[PDB]
Structure 1
Amino acid sequence: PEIRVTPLGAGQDVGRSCILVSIAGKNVMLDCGMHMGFNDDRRFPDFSYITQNGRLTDFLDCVIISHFHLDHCGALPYFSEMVGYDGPIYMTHPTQAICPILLEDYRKIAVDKKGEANFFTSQMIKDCMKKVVAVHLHQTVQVDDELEIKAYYAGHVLGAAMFQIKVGSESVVYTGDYNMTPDRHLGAAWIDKCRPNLLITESTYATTIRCRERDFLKKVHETVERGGKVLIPVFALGRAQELCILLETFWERMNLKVPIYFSTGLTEKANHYYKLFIPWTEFKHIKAFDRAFADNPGPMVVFATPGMLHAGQSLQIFRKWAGNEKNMVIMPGYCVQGTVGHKILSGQRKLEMEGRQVLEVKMQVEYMSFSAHADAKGIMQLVGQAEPESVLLVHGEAKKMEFLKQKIEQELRVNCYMPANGETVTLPT
């Protein structure tokens, strides 16, 4: 009659993520996640601590995918075909349209870092997504005649959700990345007062209480009025359109003339990602981009897409433009170590390119995280708006959670577990 939980990933870290939940009769895997920055089997979670039974499909019942960021849905094609699992996978609707692209893109980094030893091939992408059974928001869906889930709306990325798992008398709500301060990007997370037995949340930005759009625009405008170039790495999707729409609206209100470019290649969702942008909540200045005019004189803004400064476009275009004083680069996202996007953001400007050659740097470097998260204000407000019986912390760090639990159990007087990477945590009802 208990409810077991175990953060097989996301345990006091922002890397892996895999929350294995066991409700009274069934098992459910939540947010089957990945971890970049590695190059062997140690990137995917350790599923071997589930297979100490018959194979999976007898054990689990449904896997859930909160959003499309690579740290929650970047392991399905290894978990659905290699370890073996033929059971329904419940995503949201936009994530089933995005996650194939982000996966098929991450694979490019993988097979290029020569780490395809135990990996998922392109065929497995399709042969995994064919096991998806999408759900629609606020519209519960039933499996096993006793396991009913229900969606929500939390934002931070087009397609995210906060899922709710029910077996009748008891239930567990799980929240991925949510945002409570209603920034004009997607909206504020709205959950109904279901009063559930367990609520899990993320703690990315905990120990901190709009200026981003301001200073980003100011810096771009300054470096573009001097004949100087910009660089802004971004995935094939995700944080690219929340930048394109910003540049567009700021520009037609300022009537500039500088060529803007966003070259994905993997998809032209510069005019399609907007399609799915509507049912939840097409360009003028933006052209296509290729290798030809990444060198011509004139102010420029370039959006490349290997990821956090891996091999591909960004690394090359950057390696060209390092020897210039007026250009600048911004990294609107976290960076994983072992990547030049981690050398640059923290100090180092004396790099060493292919071979023993030496590259200098004279540009500017900026870190204006355009991510969407919540913090103590919004987290307290949401756990109040939910009235749980326990709150769990994942996708964060050690000391922020350790300080947060004090206030959480202090103000609202509610128990809050802080499980490490793999400890069982049981909560009885």
Structure 2
Amino acid sequence: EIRVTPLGAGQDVGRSCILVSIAGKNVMLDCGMHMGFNDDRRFPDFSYITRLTDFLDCVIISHFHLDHCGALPYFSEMVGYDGPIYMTHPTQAICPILLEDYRKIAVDKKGEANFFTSQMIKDCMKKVVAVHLHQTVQVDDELEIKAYYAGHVLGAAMFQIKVGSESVVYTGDYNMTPDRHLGAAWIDKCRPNLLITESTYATTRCRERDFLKKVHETVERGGKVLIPVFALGRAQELCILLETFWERMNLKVPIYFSTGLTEKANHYYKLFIPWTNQKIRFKHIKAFDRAFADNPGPMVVFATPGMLHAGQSLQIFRKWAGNEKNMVIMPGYCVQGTVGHKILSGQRKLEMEGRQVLEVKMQVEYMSFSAHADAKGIMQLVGQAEPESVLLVHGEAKKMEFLKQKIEQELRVNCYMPANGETVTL
């Protein structure tokens, strides 16, 4: 039989550590994380599976998002797992630059108590067997894995896990919208026993045009723009918008960029071309310096800490403010503790050290550039795979209720949406 326990994320986004037991093999299907929490709740509970080396055949990391790989250098080298971790080739490279940024958020969020070091990040990356797409990898004599093209971010794969004839495919964070970037998800008729989807957009070009219109409006009336991004997340998607629209209507006003852990978008684009073009089966954007934002006139800057975590982004956002021509675009969730949640929640009086209330009079806009499958795409992936049962391990339970109702209504299949720790049996 197949017993699946969502160890951290079965009915919430964050701490994705779904665990699958098939005929004799236990596999860990992510090692998620949670921003917000700062003490041992940021990570999944690894006390419900005890040694791990002798017990866990595989660890599988879907994509490079920090809620699917955040605990991986903690689970491997603090908890004590010595085995194979299976990331697609792009994910293995983006992940040690995404996770060396959480170590910075945590280092200054004073939350480095039970936490992974940089050396531990390198050691966890050295335990990775990076697979290619559509390649069947043998981990035992009878258990094999096979990555697919999910089309969500640069490195998203839909891993199939199979012993004999019984199998389960974890489609962690796919997409079904072919846009001006990474395309849609493809899975063939594996026809497995279980399909462990994601359900973030359960009840689900306008953003493409509106992003460029809203930066175009405030670089021509002398205002300035800040986009708070992570290191190699969704910034590289917005860079090609700010080059393609700026071929059309240049205005030749500056566009900066700043990470410190990578180049602007070239190591991303060494991997983007073969991944997007083969594996399905710039002069405008420049560099940024810490003093390069005091220059007057219009400007567009991408900042290093996402979500307005305290860093480059906080300083730049704090410094544009007071000018109503200036503007900031939020493309991400901005968790509770962050300044981003404070400004896209509705507040315009924010506090800092001492009593310095900041009169935020910037324009504030939020265009969610997250590429997940909506309602129709999830059932189209289920139709592609044609499974025997569907599992929902991402998204809120209120929408997952309706997705359960629909995916049980039209497609006559059994859908389970377990909470954290619940074990479902097939």
TM-score under structure 1 normalisation? 0.97
Q: Deviations over 1:323-363 (max 9, x none)?
A: 11111111101111011111111110011122111110111
Distance 1:16 1:272 in 2: 28
Give the C-alpha shift of residue 105 in structure 1.
1.1
Distance 2:306 2:249 in 1: 30
Evaluate the alpha carbon distance shift between residue 184 and residue 100 of structure 1 in structure 2; reply closer, same or farther with a 3 A threshold.
same
Q: Deviations over 1:296-340 (max 9, x none)?
A: 111010100112111110001111122111111111011110111
- Please tell me whether the aligned partners of residues 335 and 341 of structure 2 are also in contact (alpha carbons under 8 angstroms): yes
Give the C-alpha shift of residue 69 in structure 1.
0.4
Distance 1:124 1:336 in 2: 26
- Secondary structure of the residue aligned to 2:161 is strand
- Secondary structure of the residue aligned to 1:230 is strand
Q: Deviations over 1:368-413 (max 9, x none)?
A: 1011011121111111111110011121001111011111111011
The aligned residue for residue 333 of structure 1 is 332
Q: Deviations over 1:40-90 (max 9, x none)?
A: 111111101111xxx110110110000000000111110111110111111
- Please tell me whether the aligned partners of residues 264 and 287 of structure 2 are also in contact (alpha carbons under 8 angstroms): no
Structure 1's consecutive aligned runs of 4 or more residues displaced over 6 angstroms after TM superposition are none
The aligned residue for residue 154 of structure 2 is 158
Distance 2:191 2:3 in 1: 19
Evaluate the alpha carbon distance shift between residue 100 and residue 352 of structure 1 in structure 2; reply closer, same or farther with a 3 A threshold.
same
1:85 aligned to which of 81, 103, 128: 81
Query: How many residues get paired?
Result: 422
Give the C-alpha shift of residue 11 in structure 1.
2.0
- Secondary structure of the residue aligned to 1:383 is helix
Identity of aligned residues (%): 100
The aligned residue for residue 37 of structure 2 is 38
Give the C-alpha shift of residue 231 in structure 1.
1.1
- Secondary structure of the residue aligned to 2:274 is coil
Distance 1:376 1:118 in 2: 38
Distance 2:185 2:68 in 1: 19
Distance 1:63 1:16 in 2: 15
Q: Deviations over 1:254-287 (max 9, x none)?
A: 1221100111111115222110011112911111
RMSD: 1.6
Distance 1:241 1:170 in 2: 39
Specify which structure has the higher proportion of helix: 2
Give the C-alpha shift of residue 294 in structure 1.
0.7
Distance 1:183 1:245 in 2: 12
| Deviates further, 262-271 or 218-227 | 262-271
- Secondary structure of the residue aligned to 2:182 is coil
Distance 2:149 2:264 in 1: 22
Distance 2:326 2:256 in 1: 16
Q: Which runs of 5+ in 2 are unaligned?
A: none
- Secondary structure of the residue aligned to 1:102 is helix
Q: Deviations over 1:4-30 (max 9, x none)?
A: 001111121112211010011110000
1:173 aligned to which of 169, 173, 196: 169
- Secondary structure of the residue aligned to 1:267 is coil
Q: Deviations over 1:219-241 (max 9, x none)?
A: 11111110001111000111011
The aligned residue for residue 217 of structure 1 is 212
- Secondary structure of the residue aligned to 1:48 is coil
Q: Which runs of 5+ in 1 are unaligned?
A: none
- Secondary structure of the residue aligned to 2:331 is coil
Give the C-alpha shift of residue 417 in structure 1.
0.6
Distance 1:380 1:81 in 2: 38
Distance 1:159 1:70 in 2: 13
Distance 2:190 2:357 in 1: 60
Distance 2:39 2:340 in 1: 20
Q: Deviations over 1:136-168 (max 9, x none)?
A: 111100011111001100111011100000111
